Structures are given as C-alpha cells and as structure tokens.
Design a protein around this ligand. Structure first.
Ligand SMILES: *[C@@H]1O[C@H](CO)[C@@H](O[C@@H]2O[C@H](CO)[C@@H](O[C@@H]3O[C@H](CO[C@H]4O[C@H](CO)[C@@H](O)[C@H](O)[C@@H]4O)[C@@H](O)[C@H](O[C@H]4O[C@H](CO)[C@@H](O)[C@H](O)[C@@H]4O)[C@@H]3O)[C@H](O)[C@H]2NC(C)=O)[C@H](O)[C@H]1NC(C)=O
Ligand SMILES: *[C@@H]1O[C@H](CO)[C@@H](O[C@@H]2O[C@H](CO)[C@@H](O)[C@H](O)[C@H]2NC(C)=O)[C@H](O)[C@H]1NC(C)=O
Ligand SMILES: *[C@@H]1O[C@H](CO)[C@@H](O[C@@H]2O[C@H](CO)[C@@H](O)[C@H](O)[C@H]2NC(C)=O)[C@H](O)[C@H]1NC(C)=O
Ligand SMILES: *[C@@H]1O[C@H](CO)[C@@H](O[C@@H]2O[C@H](CO)[C@@H](O)[C@H](O)[C@H]2NC(C)=O)[C@H](O)[C@H]1NC(C)=O
Ligand SMILES: *[C@@H]1O[C@H](CO)[C@@H](O[C@@H]2O[C@H](CO)[C@@H](O)[C@H](O)[C@H]2NC(C)=O)[C@H](O)[C@H]1NC(C)=O
Ligand code: NAG
Ligand code: NAG
Ligand code: NAG
Ligand code: NAG
Ligand code: NAG
Ligand code: NAG
Lengths: 455, 143, 143, 455, 144, 451
C-alpha cells in the first residue's frame, strides 16, 4: 500500500513562451557609447557563467517552432523604430529636383549612376527658402516624364533620416532567462535542427550572438564543427527555405572606394539635412572581392552535403537570383554606415556532377555593388530610412558563415535541382544562429507514491 | 556542486536529493538579476524611455512572484507550507500508475514520471486539499 | 457558499471559515487558470499602457494584501491555521457581551463594528505574546 | 469559563470600497475580429455562470448616485475611446478657407440648405502642389468666416485640431460585464423595485455583473433593461427639481430610426498612408433622416409614467411634458450613434401631452433627426472627432427602456409640475442599468473571545 | 523604542525588537499606500507614468520580492514564521572568536554582521543542508 | 560548544539607494492649484512626521556622491518636461522680425533692452496670416543684417515652446520618503561640514520639507546653520570645487520688475494661444533688487571669519565678481512670479576684509523669457508674460563661492561667485540625510540547538 507524497524543487520543465533579457558585454558597451545595442541592452552579462551539462538526459528540439526567433524579430524591429523616433523627418524635402548628370572624372561603369540635383529647402526662418544641392545615387531618384526628378518614395512613404551620432553596428548579445525559466542548449555535433539531442546543457544566457542584418548570405556568424550542415523544415517541399552552415568561414573584402564629403544643411531649428558633398578623387563602383578557389571549395562542400538528399546520380546546379526588388535580388548589408547591394550573379553560376564542371590560383571573384540611402527596412511598404552619407572611404572585411537557398520546381527525374539565393526574411537570418537553444519553464512541484504516509 | 537542473538526468530517487537548489533559485534569480539590472548598468533612465519595455518587464517580474506565491498557497492548503517533502493520508491509485517502488524511484527520471501521470494531477490535488480539511476539522473539534 | 453565512451568527458562520479563507487571492490560481486572461488581453495591455499599469496595479495590490495578512498570521505564530488560541485574555472593555450573546444572537459583521476601535490593540498584544513565547522557547533550549 | 482572544480567519465580513474593477465579457468566438474596440478590450472571459449565493438574513445599504463603480467605468470608456481615436490620420490639413454653395440635386423641401457642396485648394502634403479638392457637408459642420458666396471654415477649427476615427474600428454596443479582482466581491440587489437608495432586502454575491451594453445617449436610454413588472422612477432628490430624474420602463418602446439617403464616399489621399473619407454624392431623392415611434405605445407608456409620477407628486396634481430648453444640439436633442453615424433627433414631438384626473394603431410619431459629422465626444473642449461617412441607407431599430427628466415645479401655486428631457451626462446613462451593484472589500481576518486557551 | 530603536543596543538587548523591523519590512507599503491612502488625484496626474508611476510600482514589487526571498530563505532552513530559532549546526571559531559576554552583550548587531560578513553564504548553506537532511530522514523514519 | 541561531528582523542596515517617493503637504487645493509639485506629488505626508532617536549610533555620511540629490535632479527634469510637453508650440514662429526701439517714459538703461517687433503670424486657418506686434527683450532677439531685420536666438538649433498658462512652478516643500525595506538617516552634528560619521543620527520617515528652489551663485529659501557659518567643500584645497556656505542668519532681499505689463492672447492655431507682450501701461524701468546693506556687511564679516579658519591665521581675504561667460552662470539667475530674473551680483562681492595688520545695495536685473534650463535641456522654453507688476521677497540662506588660483601667491586669497551645477542647491539641504537598506536577516552563536 503506497501513499501519496508531494515534492517541491522537482527537476522538470515544459516548453513555453516568455520574455528574455538582452544583455551585452561591458567593454563593447562603454566603447560603443552611442550605439543602439549597447545602450538598450545595457544589462551586463555574467562575466563567467557556469554551463550545466545535463548528464544522461535527452531533449527534443524544433528550431522551426522556436518562439525565440519570433521574439528577437519583434525586439529588433522595435529597437530600430525606437532609435529613429527622435530623429528629424524628411517630408519637407519632397520637392521637385532640378538635376543633371554629374559628369566629373567617372569610370565607364559608373556613368549615369550619380545625379547632381539642386532644389529649394526650408531655412531656419519659415518665410525663407534656400537653393541648395547634393549628389544622389540613381536607386534613390525617379524621373518625371515631362532634369525633372523626385525621390523614389517622395509621395508614397514617410521617410526619416538616421541621426548622425547613433550607431547600428552589431555587437554580441546574450539572451538571459527570467526566474522560473532556463535555456537548454543542444551541443550535439551535426544536429540537423530537429529531434532529440543527446549532448545538452543548461544555461542562464546564450553566447554572444551578433545581431547582423542580412538577406542572402550569413555574415560574422558561427560555424559548424566538422562539416557543412544543411537544414530545412521539409527537405522536399521547396516552399521551405534551406539553411547552410559552413564548417569553414569565407573572407570577403568589400568597399565603397569613394572619398566622400558629408555636408550639413539647416532645414530648420535643430533640423539638419545631411547631403553628399563632392567626391574627392575619381568615382568607382563599390565592390566585394572573394577568393575564387576558397569559393569553389566551399561550394564543393555544400554540394557534397546536398547530395545526401537528392542522390549521387543527380545533377546539381547553381543559378543566380530570380527577379524582384533589389532588397532580396542582391545581397545587401550596412557595414560602414551605408547600405551596399551586391550583384551575386557572379556567384551561384555552375553545375556539379563530379566536383565542378566550370587554374586561377590567384583569381578572385569581384561582385559589383550598388549603394543606396533610402531603405525600406524589414520590407515594410510606406516607411523608409535615409542613411546619412559617411565622409571618407568605406572598407569592410567579413566572415561568411552560412547561406540561404531555395529550390525551383519541375517534375522530372532528369532535373538539375536548381538552387537559387533566397532569404529576405530576417527571421531566417536569426534562425541560422539561434537554433541550438530553446527556453523551458521549470515546474518545481510534483507528486509520487512512497513507503511513507502521514500519521 | 550539482547545478540548477543537474539532477534532471539523475534517477528519481537520486534526483530527490538536493531539491533545495531548485526551490531557492526561483527567488535568488529574481533578486540577483534585479540588482544586476538596477545599478550594474545604471541605465534605467534609458530602459524606461519606452513605456512598453517597463510594462513587459514588470509584468514578467510580478508573474514570477505570482507563480511562486501560487505554489506556496497550493502547498499550504495541503499543509505542506515550509517543507520540500511532505506526505499525506491519501493512498496511491494504480489507476494513475501501477508501477512499484523499484519501477518508479529507480531507473526513471522525474521527467518520465511527470509525463506518466500529468493527466491525473488535478485528481490528486483534489484529494490532497480534501484531505487537509478533515485534519483541520478534527483540530476544530478539539478547539 | 462564499459569504453565504454572512448573516448567520458566529457559531454557525465559523463553519464556513475554510470556504472564505480558500478564496484569499483566488486570482493567484484563477488568473493563471484564465491563461493570463487571453493572449489578446496581453496584446491589449502592452498596446495600451494605461490598462497595463492599471491591471498590474490591481495584481500587485492583491499580492501585497495577501502578504500583509500572511505576515500578521506569522508574527502571531498562527501560520497555516484557520483558528489559533493565542494566550491573550479577553477584556471586558472590548465586549461585555455574554459568550452565548456573542457566538449566537450576533453575526460577524456586527462584531466587526463592535470592536472597531480595538482590533489593532489586540493585534499588538498578540505580537507581544508571541515574542515572549519565542524568547521563552530560546531560554528553554538554553536551560 | 474565562474568555481568551482567538484569531478567526476566513471571516465573512466586508466593507464598502472603491477600487480597480476590470472589464470582462462573453468571448463568443472573437467573430468581431478585433474590429470593435471592446474585442481588443474586455477580452477576459465571463463565460462561467455567476455564483449567485444568497446572503440569508442580510440587508445592504446601496446608493446608486454614490456608485463610484459608475465613475471608474465612465473614466475607462473615455480613456479607451480617446486612445482608440488617437492612432489615426489627423485631418488638421482640412481646416481651410473653404468655398461653399448649395447642392440642389433633387432635394426635398425639408432638407433645403442643409447640404453644401464645398471646395478649396486644401492640402496634398506635397510641397507646393495645391491640388483642388471638393466634397459634401452637412450645414451643421461648417460656418461662415466673414460677415463664391461666403468664406467658410469647419466649426471645430477655432477650438482644436480634429482626428478622423479609423474606419477599421467599430463602437457597436456589445454587452460587457465588470468583474472584481481578487479580495473583493460584487453584491447584487434583488429587492425588486429598489427605489435607488437605502437598505436592499435580499442580496446575492457574484464575481461579475450581468451584461451591460455601454450605449451612449443623451435623453433616451437605448438597448437597455426593463423594470420588474412596473414602471419605476428614481432620483437623488425628489424634492429638489434641479437633479436629473431616472425613468425605468416596464415595457420597451421600439423606435425605427433611418437615414434613407443612398450615399457614397470619396477617398482622398492626404499623405503616406494618410487617407480621408469625404462625403460623396447621394443616389436618389434626398430626404430627412428621422425616427418613427409607435404613438399608442408612447402614450400608454407615458400614462404609466404619469401614474408613477403621481405616486410621488400626488394623483390630483396636474402633470405636463414639454420639450427641452435651448442649447447646443448635444443636450437639447436626443443624440445617439447608429452604425457609426450620429443622429440628433427633435424629441419635441414626444414630450407634448398633458394629464388630468380623468378618474378622481399604426400611426407613428415622426422625429426629424439632423446628421452631424464633427463630434465633441464626452462634451470635451477640443479633441474633436470626424465621423467618416458610411455608404448606403441605414436603419437602426432600438429598444427604449427608459429616459431622463428635469422638473419645472409649480413654484408658488404648486398646482402644475412640468417635465422636460434632460441627461447628456453619460454617468446617468450608466447609473440607470448599473443600480443593483456594489463593490465590497472582504476582510477575512478577525478575533473573538472563547473559553478555549492557547495550547 | 521604535523602529531600529535598539540598533545601538547590544544584540541580547536587541534580540526581541526584531518584531518592529519585521513589521516595517512589509508595512512600509502601508505607509506608501492604503493607510497613506492614495489621493483622489492619484492616477489622473500619474497617467504621466514616467514620473512617480512605473517607478513607484517598481519600488513596491522590489520590496515585496525582498520580503519573499528572505521568507523563502528562512523556510528552506525550516523555522518558518519564527523570528528566532536554533539549528543543528555548531559554531565555527573561524567565523568569529567572541563570547556571549562579548556577543550578546558589549556589542551591537551592526558590528556583529560586519564581523561575520564574508562567511554569510557559508553558514546559510550549512543551514540549508541541515534542513534537507532532516526532512528526508523523517520520511524514511515515518515509512519504517 | 556554541551553536548557530538565525535572527530575523535584526535592526541593521547597509548603505542603500532607491527611488524615494514624494510626499507633499497637501494643505489645500490652493497649493494643488495646477502646481507641478502638488498636482503630481499626489501622495501627502504623514500629518505628524515621526523621528526615532538612535542611542549610541554613529553613521558615516557624505553629502557628496549622495544619490538622493541625483534623484531630485532626475525628478525635476522629468516633472518639468512632462508638465510643459502638452503645451502650445511656437515652432512656426520664426520669420524676419521687424523691430524698433521703444522710448515712452523709459529709463535711459531700458533703452534698447525692450523693443517693439512687428511680425507675420499664423492663424487658426492654414491659409491665412495676420500682422501682429509684440515687445521683446534684447536677450531674446538677435540682429541679422545684409539693419531692421531680426530673429529669435534659439531658432537656428531648437524648437520654441510656450509654458502652459495657469501652470505654477512655485516651489513647494517636498518630503522625500523611503519605501518599504529602506530608511532615511538624518544627521544632526552641529558643524557637521558634510562628511564623516555623524555623532548623533536618527531614522526618519521622510526628509524635512525641501523646497525645490532654483537659485544661482547662492541659496534661496533654504535652511540655516545653528551657529556661525558652515563651509562645505569636497576638496577645500582644490580651487575647482564649489564652496557651499550655510549661514545662521538669513539675508533680506526684495526683487522687483516694476513695469505695469499687459498681455495679448493671440490665436495662432486650433486651440493654440500665444501670449504676447502688449504696451507697458506705466513707465519703463529696469528690474532690480534691494539687499539689506548692513545685513550684507555683517554677513560677509561672518563668512570671511569662518573662511580664515583652515586657510591660515590672519590670512588676507578678498572678494570679486564672477568671470565672463553666459548669463546663466555669470549672474544671479532665478525665477520670480513666473518670470526669469538675471541679476548683476557685482555690487555684493567686493573689497578686502582682513581688518588687521541704514542703507540698501541695488542690484540691476534683466528679464529673460526664452530659457535653456540645466545643460541646454529646457530646449527653448518660452516664459509667457505676466500682466501687472512683479515683486518677490526672499531669504538668502547660503552662498556658492570659488577660490581663485592663488595657491602659488600665498596672499590675498580671492573668492568669486560659483554655481551653475543646480545639484548644489539641494545638496545644501540633502547633506542632512542618507538612504539605507535594512538587512534584517543574520546569525549568531547560542547556548543551545534544536531538540
Ligand atoms: C564583422 O566584424 C568585423 C570585425 O573587425 C567588422 O569589421 C570592422 O568593423 C568596424 C566597425 O566599427 C569598421 O570600422 C570601424 O569604425 C569605427 C567608427 O568610427 C566612428 O568614429 C569616428 C570619430 O570621428 C567617426 O568619424 C566615424 O564616422 C564613426 O562614427 C572607426 O573608428 C574604426 O577605426 C578605428 O579603429 C580601427 C581598428 O583597427 C583602427 O585601425 C583605426 O585606425 C581607427 O582607430 C573602424 O574604421 C572596420 O573598418 C571593420 N574592419 C575592416 C577591416 O574594415 C565587420 O564590419 C563585421 N561585418 C559584419 C557584416 O558584421
Ligand atoms: C515533406 O514534403 C513532401 C512533399 O514535398 C510531403 O509528401 C507529400 O505528402 C502528401 C500528404 O498527403 C502527399 O499527398 C504528397 O503526394 C506527398 N508528396 C510527394 C512528392 O509524394 C511530406 O509529407 C512532407 N513531410 C513533412 C514532415 O512535412
Ligand atoms: C557564369 O557566368 C560566368 C561569367 O560571369 C561564366 O564565366 C565565363 O564563361 C564563359 C563560357 O564561354 C567563358 O568564355 C568566360 O571566359 C568565363 N569568364 C569567367 C568570368 O570565368 C561561367 O562560365 C558561368 N557559369 C557557367 C557554369 O557556365
Ligand atoms: C430574493 O427573494 C426572492 C423571492 O422573493 C428570490 O426569488 C427566487 O429566485 C430563484 C431563482 O431561481 C427561484 O428559484 C425562486 O423560486 C425565487 N423565489 C420564489 C419565492 O419564487 C430571490 O432569489 C432572492 N434573492 C437572492 C439574492 O437570494
Ligand atoms: C544630538 O546630540 C544631542 C546632544 O549633544 C542630543 O540631545 C538633544 O536632543 C534633542 C531632542 O529633541 C534636540 O532637540 C537637541 O538639540 C539635542 N541637543 C541638546 C544640547 O539638547 C540629540 O538627541 C542628538 N541627536 C540625535 C538624532 O541623536
Ligand atoms: C577549385 O579549387 C581548387 C582548390 O583551390 C583549385 O585547385 C581549382 O583550380 C579551382 N577551380 C576549379 C577546378 O573549380
Ligand atoms: C551513391 O551511389 C551508391 C551506389 O551503390 C549508393 O549505394 C549510394 O546510396 C549513393 N549515395 C547517394 C547519396 O546517392
Ligand atoms: C521518373 O520515371 C518514372 C518511370 O521510370 C516516371 O513514372 C516518373 O513520372 C518520373 N518522375 C518524374 C518526376 O518525371
Ligand atoms: C546515466 O546512466 C549511467 C549508467 O551507468 C549512470 O551511471 C549515470 O549516473 C546516469 N546519469 C545520472 C545523471 O545519474
Ligand atoms: C572570551 O573572553 C576572554 C577574556 O575576555 C578571551 O580571552 C577569550 O578569547 C574570549 N573568547 C572568545 C571565543 O572570544
Ligand atoms: C549666529 O552665530 C553667532 C556666533 O557668535 C551669534 O552671535 C549669533 O547670535 C547667531 N545668530 C542667531 C540668529 O542665533
């Protein structure tokens, strides 16, 4: 005759939704004085938290149902909106522009890229206007059919410029649980994103995931352990996007090589427009260099892994993106305070049967990249962010660590399984890194039979 | 040193050891994190620029307090306030689980046991609250 | 029958002390049993700050009331008891009514008005009595 | 035999109190899909039945004119209404030197001069375009500026800016309940024909009030609840004729109100997602919005009311109903919301009859109703709200369950007492149906003597 | 006499006053509200939450949590609800080399908890361990 | 063999910090009459404030790095900003402003200071402008030239907003109060000087009534020392520190704006009203203050006597006026009646006072309407005018001084005005208090264990 007994402090938990704490390192905080991440995620991280391996435990994970990435998406869009809140609006600028081709020391490829536009802006005094001028990139200007130009979204969207002093540079972030909650981190190597995980450990806060914004390629991210890992909610349904994590990074040397000048024009009391001043030197296209051999070798790895799910008699080809807006067509990113948009068509141009079909030992693939300043962040229609120009010359170096791919259709056994760049979903950008983690609510109370009864 | 969930894989009987860690964490985390929030940054002026941040965080904090208080009341109604292990006068039902002491407290983790009898939890609670009342009744008869 | 015996005299009414005391902060379970009232309620509270602070204020006041009463039971040494004798005699200054006249022919409500100016005095006396009792226990451990 | 203090916890004792009561309602199936504002608010369910515990041998002092409960909910509806209104487009650009003329498009004699065709350059929110814009208005919403035709402004302009109520939000009167937080309770008076003050004979405890439809009205109480088998009259001060007077009816009176004009809307683009809905043309003959009320129903009802009045003021006294005094339309007429539009009805056709000690059909009373699109909601100074137009013909059918009165006494002669419609303060609209209720603080802790001693 | 009135007194003389501090440890909220009853202007001029709005509720919840954390820290050692109680842990001379004549008398509590600051987490852990042992033993003792 | 006992409720504390909550007198609605300090300090005080004496208790205090001053700073900025946020904005009120000097029964000095300025104003309707005029002070308006073109000073960098009318910033005595678990310790050491353990300390529900007074270079409507004059400085020898001086007598000052003013309530937008300065009914005179001269002399005598202490026996001490710079730091800035008085203090600090081997002092004052309070945080708050004549009568209770760099000279140590850090204005009261957190739980040895 066994008897009921109630225990408190039981090691059990459930899946749940909650709110976590955005914490950052103190060094990056104090150095990045005016950055959004440092100041919002002011909570210092544990200088040395203890990870608790869950010996002889098994836990299931499903990174496609993970509430965390949704919360991070909401939090980042909220932070982005909050940073631009006290900055000035550019709706007084929406005036017809008198423009010309700048035509001043320009290479063959950049002809027609830049326009020199003059216009009438409001002064500090509401009864006085000023004739001023600036240079514009052609992606940010549209023509009137009747020299007669406007902005792309002059009469469509509310446009706001970033304040000059605030920084959006990504910094490593840790997400810490509230009390009653813990984070379970899956450490099993070659975890495909679904199912049980043998090597699991409990943590108070995640590691320093850097919240980089990106479209097609995953930058400054984390790497697989031994081999490239391919993960997809459904391997065969092409409706789902395919995530690639490399086991070796790839360096990208990218730049805007134009010694630019930032001018400051008074719109009104305390309102400053930030204009692109005259460029010092010649005018060349921005571009990103990548090692050719490193590139093909990475592609060799990813096709080797892909063949597991489509067969080693299956032709595997990479083509460039399908049409659409620039924001998903290209690879875009905001290193250096200006928004680069890179033609990836040089990449993803091959077919693979037995390694590559195609020396070049010192060859490097050069992606041309457009620039633009008015940005429809998060693919929201009707709102936009004007990046202020950055004086000087922009140089950036980055680690590619993963890719986003999609498959086309076509019902045929002689298919080529055409992979193309995908993405454009910031959720997918988060999900590439934060997959090893889930949150769990601790239920300390339990009941069991026993040898013991109350007297 | 065991860790907060260090006993999760340990067998149920062994896992019954050092329940103190999990009892105490629910509030030690609250106080420690709150201290590391208020001053260690000294940026509450910034965090409270946004009303919604304050509402979210404050709701979460009071919810944790509420959860702990809920558990304390549900132990008190069973006369289990102030104890981490506490027995009753209710006999076990094989309907909930027919396994014996070896089959339950050995070669089983608390997770498996929790999944085993989740859908009977509401039953047991009823019996437990029911049980406590009669003891009070008898005391009230002495009183 | 929550408060169903309010008009009942004390003798019968005291049989429903469990009924009333069970409802102390039943929102600690009910609101949790209401799934925090909705997902949409959570969205409303975050979207409109005013009801955020209002409903949050309601919850914290309820918790504060719960905890105040619980401490008042604790300092008297009456934790977890619906009823407890306290080693403090009764003063004729407070009620000169017959024991029959108080426990019958009289309801709790009338009694609360009857002792309206003196309950706090009784509470202070209870605090003093329990203090002396705990000091006595310490000395008895010493002796 | 000697008595000792003993602590009694769980004591059914209570006090009167004020507090933060929270709104609840039937969840239904959220079929209003968060369109109506009170499916964003009051989303906690009241789906379980009320407890309804009889307080045997208990009598409870109620005072509906001191019902603070009314005050909190009144404040709550004001705050919610403004908060709903705020995140919408500001029609402040439409406050302009407007040029107007008469419509004269198959208009009946009654509506001559009521509708104006107005136009002006107005605004585009694009710098120096001044695209002409025109629309239709009711004469109440527009006023001459000076001593084509005359210069005109919107009536609101001199008072405050105006916000357009978003078309995606409804204010339909779905019933709501008001539920107590923990530690409190609601006491419901079942003493039928409770005259509004004093002891209530028998009473129940509940967690929530019954379903109350928070209708807005000025003179007549609409879609309300009926009295118990007898017309009832209530007043904070019967003697003082300066107090409002509440009439609760035994039978409901049906009213069929209509705007018969088959009207359209014009969508005007003010800015980036800023859209204004202008009153468009009317298809067909233009007639007057008005209400039909069953004449026999009204006269029978008012005879019953007169009997109840005579109960207080004597059954040989002479009673008269006269129309309201002068003043703005918001207080003089019977005002209400029909599907979003705002009707303002001349109730002088109702309160006209006289009564004497008589013992010691399909004909309808017509009430012409004016239509006004600028609303000073809650009698607020400023904070104007622009009701958008609604397409087509509208027909509202409503239960009149009671009304408000004010008394002109007989003064010296004290022979005849005259009654006129009153109200306009929504506190009185609440108090009519919310009169059985009182919040109560529970105090479960107490002490008492007993022969038993501490063990 | 009143709150902290025995702070300068010896620990033995201040061993009972614990009650006054105890009441305040919660009853400050009573001073904050509900005895310092919220003025009718409260929440109409505190709709501007940034002043004295959220921050007051922060203060209240923080006080509540200090109370709960300490109360749980008591109960997890046993002795729930008792101002004073002994335990089964002997005193280590490492923590303090002082006599009752020197401890209960001649010295105040502020001095004392300063003098045993660094060891606090030590003693607490021992109490926790002690309580745990007892409970388990009793259950098996009650089973046998 | 001694055993562990646990004690709960121990009367101990540690240094602590937390958002203290306000408590107003709440004496009547006339003090709650649209004043920020009462309308928004909704909580009243205990009618009978309590104080518990702490026998044989010594407590360290440091009025510097004392958190409660920073709390008061954050609270004044927050209350100010939220009070004056929902108010009529004058942001479109920037055009070429056409000014001419007024001269009608005016003091030679006021010549130019006041100025009639015709102006193009907006109306309730977007499409109409109206020609108006207003008087302006030269501190408000700047000349722009290629001669009669002018603008407002702040219009090149910041937005101009009115203070809402019928809103009073008249200071009200506030009691800062400790929440649950916290306490306030009050020091009463005579001549405490602001640092070190207080000989006699007492726990108190709340601080005494502190008026959030805004004074510059000196202290207004504050507390008084019990005897002589107290000198306070974080580093007396460092010349970059501000010397807070607390008197045991108050000095009598009467400040006045004599001109009889009138106001025009112009409509600029829907519900938006602008308060313009109409013609002066009376004569034109400069604002000024009368200080009790003999009181001032004996005051500075006491101050110099206390200054000689810790600065050398029979050391020569001299006074001089402030340095140049912006008016908010060079002159006695303060608020009287709702208008901002900017007074020349040079007639107060002068001469040498070693003195070993009745009458009134007049201080001219300018009137400024547009105000950047604190470190350019007010953001062009525009003070609306007040009809009639303005008079205030005040007590100086303390001085803010700074010593020159005379360390290398070792002679004629010269003290000048100080200030500009408004924290001082509250430090001069908040030195008396400190915030602490009760640490109720502890342990101790005993004669016995559990049975
Ligand atoms: C992946 O991670 C790598 C890590 O290296 C990133 O690469 C570097 O990122 C930094 C971003 O901080 C690049 O640029 C740096 O920006 C600083 C910002 O300057 C601010 O302050 C001045 C003050 O007047 C303003 O004028 C200016 O507008 C800015 O507001 C610069 O100050 C840095 O230069 C300083 O530090 C470097 C450190 O080596 C020194 O060499 C310089 O002399 C100077 O002291 C710096 O320029 C930096 O250029 C990136 N590296 C390279 C090689 O280009 C990647 O951006 C990141 N990528 C992604 C996708 O996440
Ligand atoms: C993954 O996708 C495949 C198809 O891409 C799914 O297989 C289909 O399952 C449905 C179920 O009714 C069948 O009707 C289809 O005929 C199947 N497709 C093929 C090509 O045979 C599969 O169910 C998906 N699995 C998961 C877990 O999502
Ligand atoms: C993808 O495009 C690149 C060019 O950007 C192709 O490379 C060229 O291929 C042609 C084939 O006739 C050669 O003549 C050129 O010399 C190649 N130039 C470069 C840049 O190498 C590449 O072949 C295309 N993809 C495939 C697999 O055909
Ligand atoms: C007050 O008294 C009346 C009777 O006068 C109660 O009415 C009863 O209502 C219940 C509701 O189902 C019926 O079952 C009973 O039949 C009714 N009584 C009679 C005599 O028919 C009413 O419920 C009482 N109010 C309260 C709160 O108890
Ligand atoms: C400060 O020390 C003095 C003794 O020097 C203490 O004595 C007096 O206390 C009363 C209390 O009302 C004060 O009004 C007097 O000013 C104090 N001094 C004198 C000379 O009478 C005093 O109690 C000490 N303060 C504290 C807080 O302990
Ligand atoms: C591919 O990479 C390898 C290794 O760097 C290199 O030898 C080869 O020339 C590259 N080109 C081909 C064959 O794709
Ligand atoms: C590769 O081909 C061999 C041939 O037998 C086959 O067994 C194996 O399954 C194939 N692997 C893939 C991934 O197609
Ligand atoms: C593959 O070939 C089989 C016959 O061998 C055929 O039935 C099937 O349709 C083919 N698959 C596709 C996708 O065309
Ligand atoms: C897991 O199983 C092994 C098998 O011997 C056992 O020794 C170990 O203790 C188990 N893990 C835990 C945490 O008990
Ligand atoms: C007790 O007091 C004696 C004499 O004052 C001293 O020598 C001894 O060290 C004290 N004991 C302790 C444990 O401090
Ligand atoms: C201030 O202190 C001096 C020091 O001698 C004394 O003469 C004077 O009377 C004191 N003032 C007051 C008002 O007590």
């Amino acid at each position: 005759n066994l008897w009921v007994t109630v225990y408190y402090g039981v090691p059990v938990w459930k899946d749940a939704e909650t709110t976590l704490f955005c914490a950052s390192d103190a060094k990056a905080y104090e150095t990045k004085k005016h950055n959004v991440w440092a100041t919002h995620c002011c909570v210092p991280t544990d200088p040395n938290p203890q990870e608790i391996h869950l010996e002889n435990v098994t836990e299931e994970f499903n990174m496609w149902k993970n509430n965390m990435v949704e919360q991070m998406h909401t939090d980042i869009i909220s932070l982005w909106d909050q940073s631009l809140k006290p900055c000035v609006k550019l709706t007084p600028l929406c005036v017809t522009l008198q423009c010309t081709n700048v035509t001043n020391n320009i290479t063959d490829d950049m002809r027609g890229e830049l326009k020199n536009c003059s216009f009438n802006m409001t002064t500090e005094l509401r009864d006085k206007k000023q004739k001023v001028y600036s240079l514009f990139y052609r992606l940010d200007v549209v023509q009137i059919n009747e020299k007669e130009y406007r902005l792309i979204n002059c009469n469509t969207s509310a446009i706001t410029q970033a304040c000059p002093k605030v920084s959006f540079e990504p910094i490593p972030i840790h997400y810490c649980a509230p009390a009653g909650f813990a984070i379970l981190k899956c450490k099993d190597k070659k975890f495909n994103g679904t199912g049980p995980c043998t090597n699991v450990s409990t943590v108070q806060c995640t590691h320093g995931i850097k919240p980089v914004v990106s479209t097609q390629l995953l930058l400054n991210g984390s790497l697989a352990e031994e081999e490239v890992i391919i993960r997809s909610e459904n391997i065969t349904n092409n409706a789902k996007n395919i995530l690639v994590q490399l086991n070796e990074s790839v360096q990208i040397n990218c730049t805007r090589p134009n010694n630019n000048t930032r001018k400051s024009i008074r719109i009104g009391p305390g309102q400053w427009f930030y204009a692109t001043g005259d460029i010092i030197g010649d005018i060349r296209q921005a571009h990103c260099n990548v090692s050719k051999a490193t590139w093909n070798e990475t592609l060799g790895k990813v096709v080797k892994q892909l063949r597991k799910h489509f067969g080693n008699n299956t032709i595997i080809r990479f083509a460039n993106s399908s049409g659409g807006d620039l924001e998903v067509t290209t690879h875009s990113f905001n290193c250096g305070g200006e928004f680069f948009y890179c033609n990836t068509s040089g990449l993803f141009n091959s077919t693979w049967i037995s390694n590559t079909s195609v020396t070049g030992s010192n060859d490097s693939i050069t992606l041309p990249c457009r620039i633009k300043q008015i940005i429809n962040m998060w693919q929201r229609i009707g709102q936009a962010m004007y990046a202020p120009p950055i004086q000087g010359v922009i140089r950036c170096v980055s680690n590619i660590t993963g890719l986003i791919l999609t498959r086309d259709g076509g019902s045929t056994n002689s298919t080529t399984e055409t992979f193309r760049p995908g993405g454009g979903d910031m959720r997918d950008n988060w999900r590439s890194e934060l997959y090893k983690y889930k949150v769990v609510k601790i239920e300390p109370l339990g009941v069991a039979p026993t040898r013991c009864k109350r007297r | 040193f065991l860790g907060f969930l260090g006993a999760a894989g340990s067998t149920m009987g062994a896992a019954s050891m050092t329940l103190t860690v999990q009892a105490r964490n629910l509030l030690s985390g609250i106080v420690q994190q709150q201290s590391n929030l208020l001053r260690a940054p000294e940026c509450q002026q910034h965090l409270l620029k946004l009303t919604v941040w304050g509402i979210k965080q404050l709701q979460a904090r009071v919810l944790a307090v509420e959860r702990y208080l809920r558990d304390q009341q549900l132990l008190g109604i069973w006369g289990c306030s102030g104890k981490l292990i506490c027995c009753t006068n209710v006999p076990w039902n094989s309907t909930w689980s027919n396994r014996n002491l070896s089959e339950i407290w050995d070669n089983m983790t608390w997770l498996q046991w929790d999944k085993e009898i989740s859908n009977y939890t509401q039953i047991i609670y009823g019996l437990l609250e029911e049980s406590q009342n009669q003891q009070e009744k008898n005391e009230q008869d002495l009183l």
